[PDB]
């Protein structure tokens, strides 16, 4: 009867940010206060509505996007931000009405030699529109010569790995990020 936020927040694996995940929260009641007190979060910033104010509101759908990035980039998960993530991987709209939660995952997403499971998009011909998901892997032309889909000089594979190591600084440490988005439609609202 109540929303299964644990499936998203306590999921054993998280997504590469360039292939960021989305889960649909439907037909349930959302306690956005127990959620504030579910654990210690590095970030719990809402844009448009407070948690208590949200406890007294109802929306059609609630999307829970989840992925992993590094510390210095959590900033970019906000309206009006620029950087590798916001420009090329995960873009929040300026008019964003939702919440951004993030916590430190170094204890789970780093390995001694480096963890290369998590990729991000390094190059792109243009910035992302809001909530766009680019999982293409076209060779990126960085110079004046066209690449013809051949990798080579200034013709790059567009993805790149973080390589999380436990001994990195926190700015380069892995953080798990859950963006909650609120969908209000002309249809029966089912999440309150």
């Amino acid at each position, epitope marked *: 009867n109540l929303c299964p936020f644990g499936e998203v927040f306590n999921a054993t694996r998280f997504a590469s940010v360039y292939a960021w*995940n989305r889960k649909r929260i439907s037909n349930c009641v959302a306690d956005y206060s127990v959620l504030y007190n579910s654990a210690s979060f590095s970030t719990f910033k809402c844009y448009g509505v407070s948690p208590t104010k949200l406890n007294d509101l109802c929306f059609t759908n609630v999307y829970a996007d989840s992925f992993v990035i590094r510390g210095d980039e959590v900033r970019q998960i906000a309206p009006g931000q620029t950087g590798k993530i916001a420009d090329y991987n995960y873009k929040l709209p300026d008019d964003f009405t939702g919440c951004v939660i993030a916590w430190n995952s170094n204890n789970l997403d780093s390995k001694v030699g480096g963890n*290369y499971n998590y990729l991000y998009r390094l190059f792109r011909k243009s910035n992302l529109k809001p909530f766009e998901r680019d999982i293409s892997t076209e060779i990126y032309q960085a110079g004046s010569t066209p690449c013809n889909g051949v990798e080579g000089f200034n013709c790059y594979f567009p993805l790149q790995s973080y390589g999380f190591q436990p001994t990195n600084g926190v700015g380069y440490q892995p953080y798990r990020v859950v963006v909650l988005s609120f969908e209000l439609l002309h249809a029966p609202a089912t999440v309150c």
Partner: antibody, heavy 129, light 110 residues
Framework: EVQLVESGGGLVKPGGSLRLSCAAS????????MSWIRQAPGKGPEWVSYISGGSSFTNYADSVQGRFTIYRDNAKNSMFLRMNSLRAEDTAVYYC??????????????????????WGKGTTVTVSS | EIVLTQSPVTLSLSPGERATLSCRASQSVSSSYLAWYQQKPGQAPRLLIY???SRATGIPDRFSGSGSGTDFTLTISRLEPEDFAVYYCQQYGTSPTVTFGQGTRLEIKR
């Protein structure tokens, strides 16, 4: 008919690279986990890497971490293994293999069927001075 | 990491006989998530059984899998000449990584 065809193997000096390709046909490529599994001369199969149908999830054998990158392209019905800094002990036949699927998720983290129901013929990688 | 010990290393039997191949795990395998594969020289492995006892599609009834926890067995009730080959077990339950056994080679006794 379901088929997987690997290519891109070869001989390279230690420290070289290869770009392995796996072309799939006969099924909805996008719905299936895809994996690379290697078999050294005289040995049994060894899991190398996997990627989920939506590319959200990736994992690697501890011994290739940071040298091999797995990715896929569902529009080309294909997946790939970028191998760099090759070492002599990476010599083996490399198979791409499919795992079957179990949905409010783009790429559901609840997935445990990491067995391989379809394999390609394989492609040979030899790393030697 | 789960270690799968397959035995014996080489099994010598005649056609028509029953073959039993053992796969023991160094720790319990969750949900019986244990698969078996057959491989012929110069060929890719092919799946025989998943979930310890589920027969893969197109596999003959003479192949059956059983077991749970740390104890798994593949039985070939009536050996045909095409069944003589190498067999691998593979764990895939609640472990950091999928793991394979080192194989049991079934050869023709004469």
């Amino acid at each position: 008919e379901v088929q997987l065809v690997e290519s891109g193997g070869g001989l390279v000096k230690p420290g070289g690279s290869l770009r392995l390709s796996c072309a799939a046909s006969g099924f909805t490529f996008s719905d299936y986990y895809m994996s690379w599994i290697r078999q050294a001369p005289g040995k049994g199969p060894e899991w190398v890497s996997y990627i989920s149908g939506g590319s959200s999830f990736t994992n690697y054998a501890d011994s290739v971490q940071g040298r091999f990158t797995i990715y896929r392209d569902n529009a080309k019905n294909s997946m790939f293994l970028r191998m760099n800094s090759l070492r002599a002990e990476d010599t083996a036949v490399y198979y791409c293999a499919r795992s079957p699927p179990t949905s409010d998720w783009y790429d559901s983290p609840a997935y445990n069927n990491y067995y391989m129901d379809v394999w390609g013929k394989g492609t040979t990688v030899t790393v030697s001075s | 990491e789960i270690v799968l010990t397959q035995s014996p290393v080489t099994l010598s039997l005649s056609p028509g006989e029953r073959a039993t191949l053992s796969c023991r795990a160094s720790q319990s395998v969750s949900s019986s998530y244990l698969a078996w594969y057959q491989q012929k020289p110069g060929q890719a492995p092919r799946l025989l059984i998943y979930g310890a006892s589920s027969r893969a599609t197109g596999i003959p009834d003479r192949f059956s899998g059983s077991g749970s926890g740390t104890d798994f067995t593949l039985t070939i009730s009536r050996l045909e000449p095409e069944d003589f080959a190498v067999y691998y077990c593979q764990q895939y339950g609640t472990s950091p990584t999928v793991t394979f056994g080192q194989g049991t080679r079934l050869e023709i006794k004469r």
